[PDB]
Design a protein around this ligand. Structure first.
Ligand code: NA
Ligand code: NA
Ligand code: NA
Ligand code: NA
Ligand code: NA
Ligand code: NA
Lengths: 497, 497, 496, 501
């Protein structure tokens, strides 16, 4: 469906105007299902990014949005939520066109996105600070929460609009001015949400959209002196660089990098549930969702049976066009990403692991032109291997065995990451013991994947800094100010007269 | 009084043992009043720092402190507070010996320190997380707050034990394990507080003290993979380096880097109060306290009179030995710091400002051997000058005029810093308008200097990242985990059978 | 006429619009002309019992109480949207029923929308706490649940606004409710129940009882299946309700109005203070719960203030609330106008001066309605009954004071504690006074503001508990401490 | 005849404490305090008058209005509350012995109590300066909106005979931490530890009138404490009948009430419970403090497949419970509190019989020589009963348990909730998921999963339904002693011009 695109903007949005790149450069956007060019958009310059940042500062300083009532900001955020639902069908199709995920996955996404905006809309006017009981007589002490200021927001290619919603909603609810740059390879739904936000109506410069991967654009967004918070979701290497650049101005950072999310299955788990959720954990969005569970840890007494049950089902996963109802798994996002996955299979082999199923591009005629990769299970591996220690971010799972509860915890925590993970067991007490010991921002007990606006999401260790979603997510966009009034000021007379 | 030192430890404290440096290196500690060597301590190695970090990790993982009840942690933090009060006299004298500040200032410090530990002791068991209303039927969602983990803590020379208290108290209250390194030039009260903490009794490895050059062990304390939070208070250049190092492991950072704190005096201020508090803001601890007000902004109609009234009083400030009750202002901290202050006077002159009073080392016989510098007032300057834009951190103030409320706000915000500031005016409504527009973490209305454990302290912009003190200060030492239990788990059956 | 042509005339119990069990009815009056405008069911005590039992059944079924908080919020938001959609007709109905101006009713409907919206947004924002247990190997959590079955009795001043303050949190939290509006002003409440039915809630979640039938109030306050009784109205009725609630140790929330003081210092903005004294005294003919009937004015400006106030009072335009030029409508009922008249007799007997007003207006177009002239009473003091007792009408008293300390002492010399104002350009002084006033809401250089984001309620005899804000929501929740011992060991205290 | 235990009462005050002075009753009336172990008079104290209570209330109001305590910094109030806590620990031994002397409970139970009481004061000391209100994001442009929390004002506090000093600590600690002024009246039959804690509080030092102690059950004293116009909150713990009367009196001034009236606390034992744990905890639930603690579990609901075995195991152990002097280390259960209370328990056994229940064991006063003079009653198990009986529907507050069977999870929940009460209860099952389902459906302020009795200052305690109004302990408990004030400042006030000029 190209007609989606006939009225879609191809430009950046800076200081209230849809504008081309300063040098008129463009980029061709691809559909991963067939590798065909589907759209062409502006490829911005570092100067365009600077300009958007300066526009955001100007707007912030003008106070039109930062001084708007929180109730009114909430209404405007709610109007965005309603736009998302109104345009659910076209937004879902656009996300499927751009990212390759199934239309059913995109629908679920748009429902979630609506709920993200709705949550933050409702939160906007619920906490402006606190009154402090001052330990000094005849003083009044209060903490006032203000918008952090100017924020730069960089989003990834896995769930572009969802990740955008997680950043935009609190930023707008709190009164910040923002500059957003989506992944250079998946900008379509982000352009669309900016059109919608423009329709809702915000003061000029409050929201700005930069497009591309232009030289130093990232560096400007992370290193500009007028930025108060840089919020980045993406690769670990890029994130570290971003944090180093933010240091030059002592700028707050929020990072969500990925993680190797463990899926711990005890022998007293509901076996069929555990297999089902291992599949779901490994292969939803071809294993590219941030919540993906690529590291299965299964108790030794059920390991052999578990491995086979998993493989039996992996063999039946239906690959195809995300627009087709029968498709269960779409393609991976890009050539570069598929190549990384292929190199990892080589690593697995070199280390002596077994490719139990999958591990190559599918041959089928209707899959030949797209960026498909078979769902894969790697067995006979251990925590010392690169394939276990490094996240591939593809439709690939590893399987390790464990003997004891203590061992499962130790193995699961033997990782540089700390994003999310699950424990499966009918023994809820045991599951809760494991959950309390796992160094992960989210632990699921007898589930896999859930996240929602009402609860914070983020990582321990190298999976990130800070939180998105929930009240903690909103707090990344606020800054505290202690105003202390002396209501009966007297000279101190410490120095001589 | 060097009997204060006859049983003071000269060693580091690592994994429950007082130990020398791995290479037996030492450093001579000086009294700034007379530049005499007063004590010799171990000068630790980068391997000593690594060892302390590994000990903190081991202890953390053992759970003896991290899994102790919050109530019990609070009792132990309270026992520290009680030790501080019990040893108030000797601790105050030690701080005066090491830092040069007056004994009265040290006494006030020790009272404050007691109150910091007491506040956090009381906070320890007041919030373990929250229950979330899950949007998914048949699920329980909770957010549990855990200690962040292993923390490294680097403190400055201005208020060594105070700054230590701000970091140690929440770290211990929340169940973290810590490695602390005080300023290489002022370690004495920090050594002493470690002896006191050891007496209170903590599991081995919970607290560790490293001594010596930040240039040796700093990179390890900021860049080690087993650290979960690096908390640094000190110079801006060092802080940026520390944050860039922390990025290598995506490590949380908390920074307080000082600031050029404005003191805004309107023509309807209580005049005598404003002069008094300008003196206090400029010259308490020879202008070296983090709350110092070096940038005075005074309304033009009272400026000429204000300048003279300030100068009249500056001429009478009594410099001397901090142990002498008549002393109002002690020396500055070191040769290096005094040299920086002298270079700044040269800058002021080169830029065309006037040294209205002071601006040199005092001549008097009893002051000749110490690191004294005269309280100084610089006039005829403006916001474009280096002397206005750069913080000297000494007994020096600049005076700028302003015509309007709007101008005062614009000038005060024309700075890279954002730590604290004051507004003086009998028109409380106007003071509140100004306070709301100042980009500062603390604004005082008709006061100067107050800070206290009940309220968060920290900076906007280049003054820092995060907060110390208050509930927010405690929160730096916690991490959130969302535990989601599915209480009626069903297969999803997204994939084929 | 078409405004009422499709409006239900019945009660709403367990998902059905029903007549009274005895088919009794009550004629509803328009205070502007005293004409009967509508006829509705006058329920029985058995009807009230049946609604309470229906609410309990629904609560126990869990369809609403176990609905997700996010979904409950969407439903409460849908109510808010209905209010805005029907803003025009709802405003006209409130004016018809209560007599207040159409402009006042419009403002009301905008506010009511915002009340539902606020609570919709709050519904899913706090489910309880994790506690750091002092017992090793235990998990301690506090789960917040709906309080249960709630009865809600509302007054005649701002019927739909007061209904919104109660309904919004009750629904957001998952309670089941039984509401009874003032017998004399049920129209907008019937309408909002039609709208809520359209939004769609499980049968029994919401129920509407109409009337002042024998023992109906007593059933709503004294039934064993009720978990909270929330009442807004007169002090005498509130006390009776609390005594009845005691028979089952039932939570009560009460809002009983108050003598709200308006303190004007000589350094106030003078014209602002006169303007706001008028607004405080005479908005809704002085019948709004935020009304300021007790003016305390500093002696040095008192004479000038009194005359400025009187000059303006003489020009206040009385008339039909539907007419744009009307500034003040009639009072609510014959009984209420009679209470106001008896208070003027008291004022005279005590030796106060009726400086202006104090009687029914004569004008031809006003003759048939329940009008009472805006009134200013001067030369009075805190020892008088007129100053100690609130009349809740278009009447203000004026007392002088010399000092800040005296103003505070006078303002606190009252059984009430609902709201009040301080007018002064000296903000530090206004803040000192505000901190010392025993009132749930204090305005500095303003009069009347209230809003869903902040709690409203009274100290002393003005009430128990709060409505609006997070505290208001909390009246509809109950805390449960669930403590799990994760390594239970025998205690072995008793011998084996 | 002298013995070292006399040092315990020799210097203990016998008077009330009003407006900073230890004073006798206005009419010099006194009351004899008894030790329930031997029914001997152990001490004589003032029995105050209604005028004494009025005077204390007026003193509290005066003090509150003076602001010396209400305007003290929260930090400083916390230090003072902490000093009280430290006094409790310092005098732990004597306070425990005194509580055992006055109430009859074992010395080990009193020791545990004093540790708890210390922790209560410590918890509130720590809480005192942690929340002064909120800044509100105002929907009106050019306004500032804040909520300031103030002490509620003058509070009256009436405590029961079961855990006199513990219940006193639950009330005093938040009242002082928040800056209220208080008037406290302990149970007329158990005032000793309350007098002692007032001596200790006076040592710590508070402004005159901030704390006041009334003693007795004098005519209309209760009525003055619940119905006086100068009171802002009445907090009562005790019987349901008294609580209702108190609430009705509080209504005359529209006065806030906080009530804790006890309850019939269910102990639900599934067939997949740890059997020996469940029998152990059923004993603990039924018989700690002779079943007089407020957390007592008198209503056992046991799944039918293990009911017979459970009933016999319970009875086998009940036969071995050691009754005796609370001061003796071997004592497992002490006497009941008074003659009137023991009589109520005896009349309930008559009711049980009339209704057709079986007294499986106990049900009478013990015969043994060393128990003959005290207010002892045998630990009792009543079987073959059902939810329609008075003995199941009404709480006896003694060393008595009833045992009902149930077949299903749904049935257990239904039966457990078929009660006018709502204080606390337990679920025993190795199936934690099931226990959690049951816990969420029970209409009780506290639910224990595989435990019985725990309460602590960090978590609120209170009842649904007729067990009470409001909460004690935790942040919610502190909040009973605070009142909210919304201060709204218009920072750019403009005339409205609604009325014509
Ligand atoms: Na991290
Ligand atoms: Na300085
Ligand atoms: Na910063
Ligand atoms: Na009125
Ligand atoms: Na009240
Ligand atoms: Na109740």
């Amino acid at each position: 469906g190209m007609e989606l695109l006939k009225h879609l903007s191809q430009r950046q949005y800076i200081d209230g105007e849809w504008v081309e790149s300063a040098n008129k450069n463009t980029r061709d956007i691809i559909n991963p299902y067939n590798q065909e060019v589907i759209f062409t958009v502006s490829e911005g310059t570092k100067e365009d990014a600077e300009r958007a940042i300066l526009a955001a500062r100007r707007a912030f300083e003008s106070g039109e949005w930062s001084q708007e009532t929180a109730e009114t900001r909430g209404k405007k955020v709610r109007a965005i939520a309603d736009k998302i639902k109104e345009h659910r069908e076209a937004l879902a199709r656009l996300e499927t066109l751009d990212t390759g995920k199934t239309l059913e996955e995109s629908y679920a996404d748009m429902d979630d996105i609506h709920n993200v905006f709705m949550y933050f809309a409702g939160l906007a006017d619920k906490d402006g600070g606190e009154m402090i009981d001052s330990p000094i007589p005849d003083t009044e002490s209060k903490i006032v929460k203000e918008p952090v200021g100017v924020v730069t927001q960089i989003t990834p290619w896995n769930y572009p609009l969802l990740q955008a919603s997680w950043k935009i909603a609190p930023a707008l609810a709190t009164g910040c001015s923002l500059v957003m740059k989506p992944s250079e390879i998946t900008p379509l739904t982000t352009i669309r949400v900016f059109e919608l936000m423009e329709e809702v109506g915000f003061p000029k410069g409050t929201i700005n959209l930069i497009l591309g991967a232009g030289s130093e654009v990232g560096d400007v967004m992370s290193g500009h002196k007028e930025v108060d918070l840089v919020s980045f979701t993406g690769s670990i290497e890029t994130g570290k660089h971003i944090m180093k650049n933010a240091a030059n101005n002592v700028t707050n950072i929020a990072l969500e990098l990925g993680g190797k999310n463990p899926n711990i299955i005890f022998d007293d788990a509901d076996f069929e549930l555990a297999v089902d959720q291992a599949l779901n954990g490994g292969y939803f969005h071809a294993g590219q969702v941030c919540s993906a569970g690529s590291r299965i840890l299964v108790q030794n007494s059920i390991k052999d049976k578990f491995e086979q049950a998993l493989i039996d089902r992996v063999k039946k996963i239906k690959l195809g066009n995300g627009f087709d109802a029968d498709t269960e798994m779409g393609p991976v996002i890009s050539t570069e990403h598929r190549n990384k996955i292929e190199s990892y299979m080589d690593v697995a082999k070199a280390e002596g692991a077994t490719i139990a199923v999958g591990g190559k591009r599918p041959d089928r005629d209707d899959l030949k032109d797209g960026l498909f990769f078979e769902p894969t299970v790697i067995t006979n591996c251990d925590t010392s291997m690169r394939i276990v220690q490094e996240e591939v971010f593809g439709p690939v799972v590893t399987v390790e065995g464990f003997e004891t509860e203590q061992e499962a915890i130790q193995l699961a925590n033997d990782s540089i990451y700390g994003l999310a993970g699950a424990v499966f067991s009918k023994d809820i007490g045991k599951a809760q013991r494991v959950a309390n010991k796992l160094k992960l921002g989210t632990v699921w007990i007898n589930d896999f994947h859930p996240y929602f606006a009402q609860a914070p999401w983020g990582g321990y260790k190298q999976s990130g800094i800070g939180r998105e979603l929930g009240k903690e997510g909103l707090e990344e966009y606020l800054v505290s100010k202690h105003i202390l009034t002396n209501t009966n000021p007297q000279l101190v007379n410490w120095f001589s007269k």
